[PDB]
Amino acid sequence: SMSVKKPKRDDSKDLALCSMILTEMETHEDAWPFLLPVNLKLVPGYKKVIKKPMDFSTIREKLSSGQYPNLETFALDVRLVFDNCETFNEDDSDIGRAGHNMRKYFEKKWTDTFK
């Protein structure tokens, strides 16, 4: 509350450290369904169903231009990628599987870097 603060967590490396996690997600072999925005002209259903499209290249541009206010907002957009994937793709499909793999991959790196 006013003039009463928990001790200050060092957040000065968060930008850099999110950038690293993102490079690792970009270079994973199962990243291909998530590297670019889904083409809304060419994928029937996507535009109406997926209220908030997200992908790695949009996260990268947001990160590079100071549109993430803190590390939690960055994690929300990475998880939105995978939530979107699960909404639109059967679990037993190459894309369905890639999404589960990438989310496991992300969550581990997140815990090891920040928790």
PDB file of C-alpha atoms in Angstrom:
ATOM      1  CA  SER A   1       0.000   0.000   0.000  1.00  0.00           C
ATOM      2  CA  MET A   2       1.123   3.671   0.117  1.00  0.00           C
ATOM      3  CA  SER A   3       4.839   3.869   1.186  1.00  0.00           C
ATOM      4  CA  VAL A   4       4.704   0.088   1.939  1.00  0.00           C
ATOM      5  CA  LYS A   5       6.503  -2.049  -0.652  1.00  0.00           C
ATOM      6  CA  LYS A   6       7.682  -5.676  -0.950  1.00  0.00           C
ATOM      7  CA  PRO A   7      11.456  -5.795  -1.752  1.00  0.00           C
ATOM      8  CA  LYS A   8      12.315  -4.788  -5.418  1.00  0.00           C
ATOM      9  CA  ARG A   9      12.738  -7.864  -7.775  1.00  0.00           C
ATOM     10  CA  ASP A  10      15.437  -7.144 -10.381  1.00  0.00           C
ATOM     11  CA  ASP A  11      13.607  -6.959 -13.734  1.00  0.00           C
ATOM     12  CA  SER A  12      16.483  -5.229 -15.695  1.00  0.00           C
ATOM     13  CA  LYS A  13      17.358  -8.445 -17.600  1.00  0.00           C
ATOM     14  CA  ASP A  14      13.771  -9.527 -18.409  1.00  0.00           C
ATOM     15  CA  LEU A  15      13.787  -8.029 -21.954  1.00  0.00           C
ATOM     16  CA  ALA A  16      16.940  -9.855 -22.923  1.00  0.00           C
ATOM     17  CA  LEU A  17      15.928 -13.040 -21.241  1.00  0.00           C
ATOM     18  CA  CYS A  18      12.427 -13.080 -23.021  1.00  0.00           C
ATOM     19  CA  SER A  19      14.360 -12.520 -26.330  1.00  0.00           C
ATOM     20  CA  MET A  20      16.424 -15.601 -25.657  1.00  0.00           C
ATOM     21  CA  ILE A  21      13.426 -17.807 -24.910  1.00  0.00           C
ATOM     22  CA  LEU A  22      11.754 -16.518 -28.062  1.00  0.00           C
ATOM     23  CA  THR A  23      14.895 -17.320 -30.255  1.00  0.00           C
ATOM     24  CA  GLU A  24      14.831 -20.829 -28.841  1.00  0.00           C
ATOM     25  CA  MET A  25      11.122 -21.175 -29.677  1.00  0.00           C
ATOM     26  CA  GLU A  26      11.815 -19.757 -33.196  1.00  0.00           C
ATOM     27  CA  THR A  27      14.561 -22.326 -33.887  1.00  0.00           C
ATOM     28  CA  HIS A  28      12.737 -25.431 -32.520  1.00  0.00           C
ATOM     29  CA  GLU A  29      11.955 -27.914 -35.359  1.00  0.00           C
ATOM     30  CA  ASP A  30       8.194 -27.928 -34.548  1.00  0.00           C
ATOM     31  CA  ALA A  31       7.918 -24.146 -34.675  1.00  0.00           C
ATOM     32  CA  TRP A  32       6.805 -24.065 -38.366  1.00  0.00           C
ATOM     33  CA  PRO A  33       2.995 -23.708 -37.712  1.00  0.00           C
ATOM     34  CA  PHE A  34       3.643 -20.648 -35.456  1.00  0.00           C
ATOM     35  CA  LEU A  35       6.385 -18.633 -37.257  1.00  0.00           C
ATOM     36  CA  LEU A  36       4.080 -16.346 -39.241  1.00  0.00           C
ATOM     37  CA  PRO A  37       0.479 -15.114 -38.929  1.00  0.00           C
ATOM     38  CA  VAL A  38      -2.134 -17.601 -40.159  1.00  0.00           C
ATOM     39  CA  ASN A  39      -3.276 -16.295 -43.639  1.00  0.00           C
ATOM     40  CA  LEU A  40      -6.866 -15.160 -42.912  1.00  0.00           C
ATOM     41  CA  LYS A  41      -7.707 -14.914 -46.641  1.00  0.00           C
ATOM     42  CA  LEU A  42      -6.700 -18.544 -47.261  1.00  0.00           C
ATOM     43  CA  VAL A  43      -7.791 -20.397 -44.130  1.00  0.00           C
ATOM     44  CA  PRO A  44     -11.583 -20.664 -43.961  1.00  0.00           C
ATOM     45  CA  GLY A  45     -12.959 -20.273 -40.457  1.00  0.00           C
ATOM     46  CA  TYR A  46      -9.872 -18.744 -38.858  1.00  0.00           C
ATOM     47  CA  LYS A  47     -10.836 -15.111 -38.905  1.00  0.00           C
ATOM     48  CA  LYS A  48     -14.288 -15.651 -37.296  1.00  0.00           C
ATOM     49  CA  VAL A  49     -13.289 -18.272 -34.803  1.00  0.00           C
ATOM     50  CA  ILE A  50      -9.912 -16.998 -33.509  1.00  0.00           C
ATOM     51  CA  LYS A  51     -10.665 -13.679 -31.852  1.00  0.00           C
ATOM     52  CA  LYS A  52      -7.057 -12.831 -31.184  1.00  0.00           C
ATOM     53  CA  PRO A  53      -4.516 -14.291 -33.698  1.00  0.00           C
ATOM     54  CA  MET A  54      -0.923 -14.522 -32.371  1.00  0.00           C
ATOM     55  CA  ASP A  55       2.362 -15.964 -33.746  1.00  0.00           C
ATOM     56  CA  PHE A  56       6.081 -15.804 -33.095  1.00  0.00           C
ATOM     57  CA  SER A  57       6.858 -13.049 -35.584  1.00  0.00           C
ATOM     58  CA  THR A  58       4.190 -10.751 -34.157  1.00  0.00           C
ATOM     59  CA  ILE A  59       5.585 -11.463 -30.583  1.00  0.00           C
ATOM     60  CA  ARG A  60       9.100 -10.653 -31.865  1.00  0.00           C
ATOM     61  CA  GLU A  61       7.996  -7.289 -33.311  1.00  0.00           C
ATOM     62  CA  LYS A  62       6.025  -6.410 -30.132  1.00  0.00           C
ATOM     63  CA  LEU A  63       9.046  -7.329 -27.997  1.00  0.00           C
ATOM     64  CA  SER A  64      11.482  -5.336 -30.129  1.00  0.00           C
ATOM     65  CA  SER A  65       9.340  -2.198 -30.088  1.00  0.00           C
ATOM     66  CA  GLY A  66       8.501  -1.993 -26.350  1.00  0.00           C
ATOM     67  CA  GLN A  67       4.940  -3.173 -26.506  1.00  0.00           C
ATOM     68  CA  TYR A  68       5.318  -5.633 -23.611  1.00  0.00           C
ATOM     69  CA  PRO A  69       4.967  -3.730 -20.324  1.00  0.00           C
ATOM     70  CA  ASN A  70       6.313  -6.625 -18.296  1.00  0.00           C
ATOM     71  CA  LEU A  71       7.396 -10.318 -18.576  1.00  0.00           C
ATOM     72  CA  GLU A  72       3.807 -11.542 -17.789  1.00  0.00           C
ATOM     73  CA  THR A  73       2.325  -9.843 -20.739  1.00  0.00           C
ATOM     74  CA  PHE A  74       4.930 -11.560 -22.937  1.00  0.00           C
ATOM     75  CA  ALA A  75       4.003 -15.007 -21.467  1.00  0.00           C
ATOM     76  CA  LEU A  76       0.255 -14.330 -22.136  1.00  0.00           C
ATOM     77  CA  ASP A  77       0.940 -13.802 -25.884  1.00  0.00           C
ATOM     78  CA  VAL A  78       3.172 -16.913 -26.108  1.00  0.00           C
ATOM     79  CA  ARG A  79       0.414 -18.972 -24.393  1.00  0.00           C
ATOM     80  CA  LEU A  80      -2.203 -17.414 -26.676  1.00  0.00           C
ATOM     81  CA  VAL A  81      -0.370 -18.940 -29.616  1.00  0.00           C
ATOM     82  CA  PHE A  82      -0.859 -22.432 -28.216  1.00  0.00           C
ATOM     83  CA  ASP A  83      -4.457 -21.799 -27.003  1.00  0.00           C
ATOM     84  CA  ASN A  84      -5.331 -20.657 -30.506  1.00  0.00           C
ATOM     85  CA  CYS A  85      -3.654 -23.759 -31.916  1.00  0.00           C
ATOM     86  CA  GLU A  86      -5.705 -26.023 -29.594  1.00  0.00           C
ATOM     87  CA  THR A  87      -8.915 -24.226 -30.500  1.00  0.00           C
ATOM     88  CA  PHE A  88      -8.514 -24.850 -34.216  1.00  0.00           C
ATOM     89  CA  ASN A  89      -6.562 -28.149 -34.629  1.00  0.00           C
ATOM     90  CA  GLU A  90      -7.343 -31.710 -33.542  1.00  0.00           C
ATOM     91  CA  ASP A  91      -4.852 -33.081 -30.955  1.00  0.00           C
ATOM     92  CA  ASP A  92      -4.051 -35.966 -33.355  1.00  0.00           C
ATOM     93  CA  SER A  93      -2.733 -33.854 -36.228  1.00  0.00           C
ATOM     94  CA  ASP A  94       0.782 -32.676 -36.964  1.00  0.00           C
ATOM     95  CA  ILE A  95      -0.091 -29.098 -36.069  1.00  0.00           C
ATOM     96  CA  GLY A  96      -2.065 -30.224 -32.920  1.00  0.00           C
ATOM     97  CA  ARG A  97       0.962 -32.151 -31.725  1.00  0.00           C
ATOM     98  CA  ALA A  98       3.456 -29.359 -32.555  1.00  0.00           C
ATOM     99  CA  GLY A  99       1.410 -27.026 -30.346  1.00  0.00           C
ATOM    100  CA  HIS A 100       1.488 -29.370 -27.336  1.00  0.00           C
ATOM    101  CA  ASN A 101       5.241 -29.922 -27.802  1.00  0.00           C
ATOM    102  CA  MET A 102       6.002 -26.213 -28.068  1.00  0.00           C
ATOM    103  CA  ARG A 103       3.928 -25.277 -25.070  1.00  0.00           C
ATOM    104  CA  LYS A 104       5.766 -27.916 -22.905  1.00  0.00           C
ATOM    105  CA  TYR A 105       9.034 -26.582 -24.237  1.00  0.00           C
ATOM    106  CA  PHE A 106       8.092 -22.957 -23.445  1.00  0.00           C
ATOM    107  CA  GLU A 107       6.747 -23.677 -19.932  1.00  0.00           C
ATOM    108  CA  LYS A 108       9.963 -25.395 -18.896  1.00  0.00           C
ATOM    109  CA  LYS A 109      12.198 -22.599 -20.121  1.00  0.00           C
ATOM    110  CA  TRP A 110       9.944 -20.083 -18.394  1.00  0.00           C
ATOM    111  CA  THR A 111      10.128 -21.842 -15.006  1.00  0.00           C
ATOM    112  CA  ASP A 112      13.904 -22.397 -15.272  1.00  0.00           C
ATOM    113  CA  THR A 113      14.682 -18.747 -16.258  1.00  0.00           C
ATOM    114  CA  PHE A 114      12.223 -16.924 -13.899  1.00  0.00           C
ATOM    115  CA  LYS A 115      10.870 -19.253 -11.021  1.00  0.00           C
TER     116      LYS A 115
END
